Design a protein around this ligand. Sequence first.
Ligand SMILES: [K+]
Ligand SMILES: [K+]
Ligand SMILES: [Zn+2]
Ligand SMILES: [Zn+2]
Lengths: 339, 342
Amino acid sequence: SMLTYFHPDQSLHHPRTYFSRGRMRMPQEVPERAARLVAAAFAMGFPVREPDDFGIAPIAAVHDTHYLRFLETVHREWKAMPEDWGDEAMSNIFVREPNALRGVLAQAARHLADGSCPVGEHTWRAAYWSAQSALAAAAAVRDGAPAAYALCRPPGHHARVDAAGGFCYLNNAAIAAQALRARHARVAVLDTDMHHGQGIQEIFYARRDVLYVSIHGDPTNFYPAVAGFDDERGAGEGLGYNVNLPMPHGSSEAAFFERVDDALRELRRFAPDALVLSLGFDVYRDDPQSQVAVTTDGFGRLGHLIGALRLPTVIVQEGGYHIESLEANARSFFGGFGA
Amino acid sequence: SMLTYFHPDQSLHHPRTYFSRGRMRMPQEVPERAARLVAAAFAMGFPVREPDDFGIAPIAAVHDTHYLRFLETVHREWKAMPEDWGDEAMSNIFVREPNALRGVLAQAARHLADGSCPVGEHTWRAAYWSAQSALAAAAAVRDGAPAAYALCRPPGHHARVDAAGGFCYLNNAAIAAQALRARHARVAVLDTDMHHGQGIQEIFYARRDVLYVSIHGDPTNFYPAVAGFDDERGAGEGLGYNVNLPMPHGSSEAAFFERVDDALRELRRFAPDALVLSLGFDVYRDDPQSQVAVTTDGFGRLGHLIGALRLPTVIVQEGGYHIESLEANARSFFGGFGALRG
Ligand SMILES: [K+]
Ligand SMILES: [K+]
Ligand SMILES: [Zn+2]
Ligand SMILES: [Zn+2]
């Protein structure tokens, strides 16, 4: 058993509009994901609690405040434009700079980094409370709990210092790592979600107080497409403290646990005082976003390998979109973590 | 009587997919636009000619060759991806940098700057030859003609050094300004299209040999959105040689002609040896994209004021999407333009 944090306002976010790979697409990051995960927590006896409100400052500790202002007001500003612009803020102008940042359209152009981060009426509210779950889990562990589960939804690891992306708005995991830093000198973030966490990579790129390690599918024509390659090793004093571990599309379960063995070598050498685990079930064989053949039992083995580290660990929910397997995969993972 | 250049391969580009302001939208930059302007040209006794092939060098004089190779190959590399991706290359990852440029998706992220520049089977060809029409008109002027009309389509002025955008792939006006620099020490580019020519601006931003002056709608919540504000005046030696003349949304025709007046004052102070006119008919008051109340006879007033400069002038077609008034608006423009010439 460990504390699991989830706020019901997290279910309110449900936008309809996603642009990807030439066409508009069906939403995959839906409220039902959190319903299945809560069911799994219940079946394992975990207490599921509402996080306290830690306020904006710990979010601002990671994200640029002009981005957070944008995020908070964009739906209201988008609603004041013609009915014809629709109900969800999205960017159709793909320019960070040069950029005057005058008007909501120019602001979307800077602060929404792909066609997968629509901002609806309840998006900021849901995103805010998903970050608070991360913070609550981080607080619990900071104060002495060996582990807690942040049941984050919307997910976070694609959110950059000043831009949303890939169904993410606020980088829950990075926010949790920065909270742990108040007490621990060395924090590691390990991300095993199917996709590279380009947001987490960017936030800590020039730093060595937080290690980042990611196992993910080869980003050649695969989200996030422009980062995640193995020659991205950090900058300045962060050089040597960012490790990308990509896998060929169509990899075996074995190849994934090879990458987990690389990750465990990097962690041993860094010797972290605390761990944030960005966990995704989209490595599952039947997840439609999957590029590796991880089985339900595989999640149990991953859970065991990380739990045996006996580090203070905040587990932060990221992706995984195959609704009917979420409960089984979560239960296998947490069963291995606790054995 | 003015030489008009048009190549029929320009008519081949007809993409189906545009994404802007929250949704997929109907194509506005369609082949029929060329057909109406060619018929306008004829009806005024303009000789219409196909441009000779000036080759890739003058295009690559302005554009990055990574971007040019990408334009030429992207449709084929995109057809290699799953049929679910569709037939037209478009970006859904809005990141130019950092960008490792591995795979066609990352190449698109870098080289397609908005949801209005889809690349279909014949986009490269049409864009290539649209540029050749610009080069043919500039050549004719370079060699002694007093004016020439490049019937460009697709348009060009939103095309940056390294990226397509806004229905534009190759920056025709810029390509003509640079060619004219072969014979002329100072060239000016005047842009009266409804939208800010952010590509032309970028190309010449640190140069004082090519002035850029653009009249357009206030870019606050209006394409190109991120550029075209009046404090953008150039860099280095080109400080003072970039002039943006925005107008409030829903401006009167009187307001438009006040801005034309400001613009002519800048041209006089600069004293160009030759002029490139990026002309758009989307200031027309019933054009869907319009934010100013310009009438049909207003195009005549515009042509008259610009023709009275009596400068060697390459007229370069940019936008204008109201099909049923295109012929009447162009005829009025050209009829005003010749008035005080010769
Ligand atoms: K990952
Ligand atoms: K303009
Ligand atoms: Zn993922
Ligand atoms: Zn225009």
